Amino acid sequence: NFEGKIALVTGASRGIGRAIAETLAARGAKVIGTATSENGAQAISDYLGANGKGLMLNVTDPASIESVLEKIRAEFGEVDILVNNAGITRDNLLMRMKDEEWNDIIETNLSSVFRLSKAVMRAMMKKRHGRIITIGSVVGTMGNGGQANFAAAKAGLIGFSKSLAREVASRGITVNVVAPGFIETDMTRALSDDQRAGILAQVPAGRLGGAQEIANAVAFLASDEAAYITGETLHVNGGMYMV
Amino acid sequence: NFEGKIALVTGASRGIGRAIAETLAARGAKVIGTATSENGAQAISDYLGANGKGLMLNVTDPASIESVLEKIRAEFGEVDILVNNAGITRDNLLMRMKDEEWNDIIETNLSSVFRLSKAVMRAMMKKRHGRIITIGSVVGTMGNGGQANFAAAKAGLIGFSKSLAREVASRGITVNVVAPGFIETDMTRALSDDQRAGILAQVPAGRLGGAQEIANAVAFLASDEAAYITGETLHVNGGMYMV
Amino acid sequence: NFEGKIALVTGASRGIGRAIAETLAARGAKVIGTATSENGAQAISDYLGANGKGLMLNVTDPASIESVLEKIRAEFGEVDILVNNAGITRDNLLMRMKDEEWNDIIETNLSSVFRLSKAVMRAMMKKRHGRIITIGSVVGTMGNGGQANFAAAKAGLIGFSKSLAREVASRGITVNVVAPGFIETDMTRALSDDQRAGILAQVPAGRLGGAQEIANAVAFLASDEAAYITGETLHVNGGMYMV
Amino acid sequence: NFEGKIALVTGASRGIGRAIAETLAARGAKVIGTATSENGAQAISDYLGANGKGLMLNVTDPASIESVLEKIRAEFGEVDILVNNAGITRDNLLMRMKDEEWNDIIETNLSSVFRLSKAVMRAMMKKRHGRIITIGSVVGTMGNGGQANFAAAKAGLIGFSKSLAREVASRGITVNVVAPGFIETDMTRALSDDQRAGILAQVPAGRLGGAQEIANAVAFLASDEAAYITGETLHVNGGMYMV
């Protein structure tokens, strides 16, 4: 139960992001989901209704980051739960990877984690309680051909979280990572029927995971039932990989 | 909420074992906790009340295993959730470790996992649904001086679970491990303040974990909210170790 | 260069075991390879020639273990390098796994590591120098359907080594594990041309590893060039798995 | 023995970098060590003598990267072995970490790995053989208070290497990481005995590691004796951490 808790879920327009936003809201938290346009920010506001609000945010723009937080402190208050789910992909074999494809992935997938975590830390420490959860990926752990940039960022955010976790552990703040395997979303519904089959062959469970399933893991970690879990990575991949 | 689910929690006399038994019961499951003595069984039966029953079980005795399950199928039904929490410790530096101290730890901490998991598998596969959760230990992952035997068994049960997970993943059955760090028990409660400070010194969180906190992790994994998590190890150690 | 060093390589009749025995011998060590029969022990003596000797050993028989070591101390001296490579497989889905198939794998693959390591420890500690290397398997880390017993033992020996490593680290003794992926041996040359292809599909390198390649890793770890490596697991699997 | 092999070791002015440069050179490779200043290049050239040359390089400057490689193809030839050892530290608790301290660490410690690996790939793929080794850190795996930026980059380069490894594995090219623990450098040599005791307290081996010891691990991985090792991380930390 997250009654009275304020959660900021970056990139909450669809799939995992949205399921996270809706699940936290359904369990009592005032949720602020974000998108990169006024349109998307509105759509989020529409589905969250009176439970939260949608705000436009660019996780790579320091200005956008403080601006968004300011509003939040004004209309709702200090952020208690941060869920870093904003991220993108710029797949390509190393040989064909453009410098911009590397830099954007790093800036958006990794650096974003540092900026936002840093931006909500002070308030959490004062209250001596908080939750920071970043949506990683099984790729950050096993790596994947054609995704060296994506993998670097996903692996990197775990290294980041482990270190931050050690800095604020005693202050009642946990920093964890939920690593999804293949989840049914846009990026999987737009794959040919053959690619889809190729994907399922790697998953012992024999089915793609659900966005909601990733949301359930986040909610658990964001709750008070997971206060002794920090610096940990929770893999939700149907057995695709086991650590 | 495990409405209509039957859970068998081995070694449910106290601490982690008991908290697991009570938490599953509080959330709607009919729980069967076990002990080595008729006393314990009865004590377990008293605290579980109408939610479950206590039965005497020796996880190293094939006969006892058969027998206990038999009594469960007769009075309650097929086991849906298995929680392997029975285990012991026979600490000693390798050079002073007795052969019996190695064999007992292996028989009770590792082999037990094979015997019980195997014993509840068929019914689970038929129902095309099930949960197997073993209580490991952070020691299984980082190892520990004077606990080579304990460490072998805890590390070993993860290897076991990973393999079993791959065998029954497609059948709607997950096999996971929850690895506790230092948890407040009767052993630690009776330690001197200096001894306790030497343990706390290792935990970034700055406190021992709570038996209930381990119970919460198990409940999450045992629920339908964790259907896409299998072959995974969930570390609940306050940051003592991060993988 | 292992001039003046004595190495005991268990199960050195073929493949990995033999390549290890020959490589250590070629680099100056007096090698004692073992087998389960007088015949095999002789064959080993024949290929090692003046570099070592073959002895009959049963890693599950405490009597055989001290008996073999005694001779070694009599004809060569104290063991400086221990390479646990003896091991077997009793594959079967959990449902069809016989109690004897579980017990034998554990006794031969895991318990053996404890008995032999314990048996050569005293001398190593006195000399304040030594090397203990156990041949694990990628299966101990990722697990594998139909090999729950094998996986438990391989995972378990890592837990064991980590703990032992912590006990003797300061005494100039390292305890490590080399985890091979699919290696060309009898157990792979006796697979149908289809199973072989299935195996290669999992290996980025696109070829089975060589017994000699596993031997090279062991030699490195057994040398003085790896004195700061302990409690570590070296994966040699062509990219089949990455940790 | 790298007879006829060309190795490029970034940041080879001292410690680990230098030991790597000298060890590869001593074993027959023509080595090109790099520094940020013309001084360093020359100093490197002096100690390498006729075995190699020193060149000024800035791993964050695409121009410098191009340029340096250009000079190497002209005077020596295509790079066969790449050792990414250039890196820096900008320690600080998250709340006091400057944006420049995050960006510089990422640009220099992580992005550099992408730029240089990409820059030597084509020739390696053509030769259907190559070695890429990056010097990580135990911090990338366990994280560390006050080093969130360093940790992110070190963890990130592993994710990168794993993915690249999968892309070029079949082409006879391995991509690995050597993760040193506490290594005796000019920073530690100048610490007070109490500060040194606080580090030694963490190392089971009971001493700092030697720069040469890290060099030995790299040489092993760079040799033909490690052709079946890729996407792997080799921990050389005296037991400070065990994975």
Q: Which tokens go with A101?
A: 């494809």
Q: How far is A35 from chain D (nearest CA, A)?
A: 24
CA dihedral B103→B107→B109→B111, nearest 10 degrees, is 140
Q: What is the total residue count of chain B? A: 243
Q: Which tokens go with D115?
A: 């730029």
- Could you give the CA distance from residue C206 to residue A67 in angstroms, rounded to a whole number? 52
- Could you give the CA distance from residue A6 to residue A55 in angstroms, rounded to a whole number? 14
- Could you give the CA distance from residue A217 to residue A48 in angstroms, rounded to a whole number? 20
DSSP A208: P
Phi, psi of D87, rounded to the nearest 5 degrees: 180, 160
Burial of residue B9 (CB within 10 Å: 0-12, 13-18, 19+) is buried
CATH number at B1-243: 3.40.50.720
Among D228, A36, D169, A185, smallest CA distance to C209 is for: D228
Q: Which residue do the tokens 């080594």 mark?
A: C161
Is the distance from CB of A205 to CB of A10 less than 8 angstroms? no
Closest partner CB to B159 (pick from C62, C151, C161): C151
Query: D225 — contact with chain C (CB < 8 Å)?
Result: yes
Q: Which tokens go with A53?
A: 């609000």
Q: Which tokens go with D168?
A: 């070029």
Closest partner CB to C239 (pick from D169, D220, D225): D169
> Terminus-to-terminus CA distance in chain B, angstroms?
30
Query: A65 — contact with chain D (CB < 8 Å)?
Result: no
- Could you give the CA distance from residue D177 to residue D161 in angstroms, rounded to a whole number? 8
Burial of residue D95 (CB within 10 Å: 0-12, 13-18, 19+) is exposed
Q: How far is C233 from chain B (nearest CA, A)?
A: 12
Measured between beta carbons, the chain D residues lying within 8 angstroms of A95 are 118, 121-122, 125
- Could you give the CA distance from residue D227 to residue D243 in angstroms, rounded to a whole number? 22
Mark which residues 122-151 of A lie under 8 Å from C by CB: 142-143
Q: Which tokens go with A218?
A: 């986040």
Phi, psi of B10, rounded to the nearest 5 degrees: -70, 140
Identify the helix (H) or strand (E) that includes residue B124: helix B112-127
DSSP D41: H
- Could you give the CA distance from residue D225 to residue D131 in angstroms, rounded to a whole number? 12
- Number of continuous H segments (helices) and E segments (strands) in chain D: 10, 7
Identify the helix (H) or strand (E) that includes residue B29: none
Q: Which tokens go with B107?
A: 């028989």
Is the distance from CB of C178 to CB of C133 less than 8 angstroms? yes
Closest partner CB to B93 (pick from C152, C157, C167): C167
Long-range contacts of A28-33 (CB under 8 A, 24+ apart): A28/A1, A28/A2, A28/A3, A28/A4, A29/A2, A29/A3, A29/A5, A29/A80, A29/A81, A30/A5, A30/A6, A30/A76, A31/A7, A32/A6, A32/A7, A32/A8, A32/A72, A32/A76, A32/A79, A33/A9
Residue D225 vs residues B124, C41, D126, D167, D235: alpha-carbon distances, Å: 47, 28, 21, 21, 18
Please say whether the dihedral angle defined by the alpha carbons of residues C43, C46, C51 and C52, taken in this order, is positive or negative. positive
**Gap positions in chain C, given as the residue before each gap (C–N > 2.5 A)?**
none
Secondary structure string (H, E, C) spanning chain C: CCCCCEEEEECCCCHHHHHHHHHHHHCCCEEEEEECCHHHHHHHHHHHCCCEEEEECCCCCHHHHHHHHHHHHHHCCCCCEEEECCCCCCCCCHHHCCHHHHHHHHHHHHHHHHHHHHHHHHHHHHHCCEEEEEECCCHHHHCCCCCHHHHHHHHHHHHHHHHHHHHHHHHCEEEEEEEECCECCHHHHCCCHHHHHHHHCCCCCCCCECHHHHHHHHHHHHCHHHCCCCCCEEEECCCCCCC
Rg (CA), chain D: 17
Q: At residue D91, what is the residue type?
A: D
- Could you give the CA distance from residue B111 to residue B108 in angstroms, rounded to a whole number? 6
Is the distance from CB of A155 to CB of A112 less than 8 angstroms? no
Q: At residue B234, what is the residue type?
A: L
Provide the CA D125 distance to its chain's centre, in angstroms.
21
| CB-side neighbour CA atoms (13 Å) of C71 | 15
Rg (CA), chain A: 17
Q: How far is C21 from chain B (nearest CA, A)?
A: 26
Identify the helix (H) or strand (E) that includes residue B127: helix B112-127
Phi, psi of D77, rounded to the nearest 5 degrees: 135, -165
Q: Which tokens go with D42?
A: 């020359």
The region, left, alpha or beta by phi > 0 then psi within -120 to 50, assigned to residue A86 is beta
- Could you give the CA distance from residue B34 to residue B17 in angstroms, rounded to a whole number? 9
- Could you give the CA distance from residue B97 to residue B95 in angstroms, rounded to a whole number? 6
- Could you give the CA distance from residue D180 to residue D199 in angstroms, rounded to a whole number? 14
Is the distance from CB of B196 to CB of B206 less than 8 angstroms? no
Chain D neighbours (≥3 Cβ pairs under 8 A) are A, B, C
Query: A72 — contact with chain B (CB < 8 Å)?
Result: no
Among A163, A232, A106, smallest CA distance to D108 is for: A106
Residue C48 vs residues C52, C86, C216, D154: alpha-carbon distances, Å: 5, 18, 17, 44
- Could you give the CA distance from residue D158 to residue D152 in angstroms, rounded to a whole number? 10
Please say whether the dihedral angle defined by the alpha carbons of residues D149, D155, D158 and D164, taken in this order, is positive or negative. negative
Pairing of strands A233-236, B52-56: unpaired
Mutation site, B93, B139, B142, B235, interface D, largest D CB count within 10 A:
B142
This entry's atomic model was obtained through X-ray
Query: D242 — contact with chain B (CB < 8 Å)?
Result: yes
Query: C49 — contact with chain D (CB < 8 Å)?
Result: no
Q: Which tokens go with B161?
A: 């679970």
Q: Which tokens go with A88?
A: 């993108």
Is the distance from CB of D204 to CB of D239 less than 8 angstroms? yes
- Could you give the CA distance from residue A22 to residue A51 in angstroms, rounded to a whole number? 9
Is the distance from CB of D140 to CB of D161 less than 8 angstroms? no
Closest partner CB to A239 (pick from B169, B220, B238): B169
Query: B110 — contact with chain C (CB < 8 Å)?
Result: yes
The resolution of the experimental structure, rounded to one decimal in Å, is: 2.5
- Could you give the CA distance from residue A115 to residue A98 in angstroms, rounded to a whole number? 24
CA dihedral C150→C154→C156→C162, nearest 10 degrees, is 180
- B164/C94 CB distance under 8 A: yes
D155 to chain C: nearest residue by CA?
C243
Query: D172 — contact with chain B (CB < 8 Å)?
Result: no
Pairing of strands C130-135, C81-84: parallel
| CB-side neighbour CA atoms (13 Å) of C240 | 27
A110 to chain D: nearest residue by CA?
D152
D138 by DSSP, 3-state: which?
Answer: helix
- Could you give the CA distance from residue D59 to residue D34 in angstroms, rounded to a whole number? 10
Measured between beta carbons, the chain C residues lying within 8 angstroms of D182 are none
β-partners of residue C235 are C179
DSSP A177: E
Is the distance from CB of D233 to CB of A159 less than 8 angstroms? no
- Could you give the CA distance from residue D29 to residue D76 in angstroms, rounded to a whole number? 11
Closest partner CB to C163 (pick from B114, B148, B159): B148
Q: Which tokens go with A209?
A: 């995971």
DSSP A106: I
Is the distance from CB of D57 to CB of D35 less than 8 angstroms? yes
DSSP D209: B
A158 to chain B: nearest residue by CA?
B243
Chain C neighbours (≥3 Cβ pairs under 8 A) are A, B, D
- Could you give the CA distance from residue A68 to residue C222 in angstroms, rounded to a whole number? 57
Identify the helix (H) or strand (E) that includes residue A176: strand A173-180
- Could you give the CA distance from residue B133 to residue B112 in angstroms, rounded to a whole number? 13
Provide the CA A129 distance to its chain's centre, in angstroms.
19
> Terminus-to-terminus CA distance in chain D, angstroms?
30
Query: B163 — contact with chain C (CB < 8 Å)?
Result: yes
- Could you give the CA distance from residue D213 to residue D168 in angstroms, rounded to a whole number? 28
Q: Could you tell me the residue ranges of all domains in chain D?
A: 1-243
Identify the helix (H) or strand (E) that includes residue A174: strand A173-180
Q: Which tokens go with B123?
A: 């019914």
- Could you give the CA distance from residue B31 to residue B4 in angstroms, rounded to a whole number? 11
- C229/D243 CB distance under 8 A: no
What value, to the nearest 5°, has the Cα angle with vertex B16 and ends B11 and B22? 85
Burial of residue D34 (CB within 10 Å: 0-12, 13-18, 19+) is buried
Mutation site, D162, D176, D202, D233, interface A, largest A CB count within 10 A:
D162
- B229/A220 CB distance under 8 A: no
B195 by DSSP, 3-state: which?
Answer: helix
Is the distance from CB of D24 to CB of D31 less than 8 angstroms? yes
CB neighbours of residue C189 within 10 Å: 9
CA dihedral A218→A224→A227→A229, nearest 10 degrees, is -20
Is the distance from CB of A187 to CB of A207 less than 8 angstroms? no
Long-range contacts of C72-77 (CB under 8 A, 24+ apart): C72/C6, C72/C8, C72/C32, C76/C6, C76/C30, C76/C32, C77/C6
Q: Give the E-state strand segments of D42-120 in sequence order.
A: 52-56, 81-84
Q: Which residue do the tokens 């190892």 mark?
A: B143
D6 by DSSP, 3-state: which?
Answer: strand
- Could you give the CA distance from residue C54 to residue B73 in angstroms, rounded to a whole number? 55
Q: Which tokens go with C106?
A: 């554990």
Q: Which tokens go with B75?
A: 């009075």
Residue C221 vs residues A32, A158, C49, D135: alpha-carbon distances, Å: 53, 29, 24, 19
Measured between beta carbons, the chain A residues lying within 8 angstroms of D167 are 93-94, 145-146, 148
Closest partner CB to D210 (pick from C209, C228, C243): C228
- Could you give the CA distance from residue C131 to residue C124 in angstroms, rounded to a whole number? 8
- Could you give the CA distance from residue B230 to residue A213 in angstroms, rounded to a whole number? 13
Q: Which tokens go with B240?
A: 């003592």
